[PDB]
Design a protein around this ligand. Structure first.
Ligand code: HEM
Ligand SMILES: [C-]#N
Ligand SMILES: [Zn+2]
Ligand SMILES: [Zn+2]
Length: 153
């Protein structure tokens, strides 16, 4: 479990994202899709996008980035007490969207990478450490529900 000091770090950083949630979401999704193209294929909604310019121009992609980071923000603000928030996400990602846990690792690395872009004067080492712990806890708990459902090794 994260310490309170580590949660403080997580949420300080998170408040940063909230200054421009759509901008952060955009950059995170694009970094995910470009770094790991197998992920884009999982989105019927986005798979027509063939270049980073097209991705940056997509208003719908930006709208979806806000849905994603709104859900993740809410989970982080529960400081590990996120059973009710995670249940429907693990269910739809395992059984409907068919997203492997590996891809949740990729989007976690994209989140970290986009922070090294947007908060390069904060996002200190301590904060990077805590954010990776928070995202690992998120993946651990989703993986446990994947396994229950026959989707996690
Ligand atoms: C930080 C991790 C993530 C969070 C918080 C998140 C959150 C969400 C939410 C809130 C929705 C809409 C509700 C739902 O369908 O349950 C959704 C939809 C979706 N997610 Fe995620 N997601 C994450 C990671 C991923 C990843 C890594 C992928 C694929 C590589 C993915 C694929 C999808 C797809 C395909 C949809 C349906 C989009 C549509 O067609 O409208 N998700 N996600
Ligand atoms: C989900 N994006
Ligand atoms: Zn990849
Ligand atoms: Zn990556």
């Amino acid at each position: 479990v994260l310490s309170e000091g580590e949660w403080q770090l997580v949420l300080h950083v998170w408040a940063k994202v909230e200054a421009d949630v759509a901008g952060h979401g955009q950059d995170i999704l694009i970094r995910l899709f470009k770094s790991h193209p197998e992920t884009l294929e999982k989105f019927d909604r986005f798979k027509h996008l063939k270049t980073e310019a097209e991705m940056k121009a997509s208003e719908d992609l930006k709208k979806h980035g806000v849905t994603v980071l709104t859900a993740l923000g809410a989970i982080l603000k529960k400081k590990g007490h996120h059973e009710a928030e995670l249940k429907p996400l693990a269910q739809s990602h395992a059984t409907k969207h068919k997203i492997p846990i590996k891809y949740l690792e990729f989007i976690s690395e994209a989140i970290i990478h986009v922070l090294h872009s947007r908060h390069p004067g904060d996002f200190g080492a301590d904060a990077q450490g805590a954010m990776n712990k928070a995202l690992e806890l998120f993946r651990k708990d989703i993986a446990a529900k994947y396994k229950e459902l026959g989707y996690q090794g």
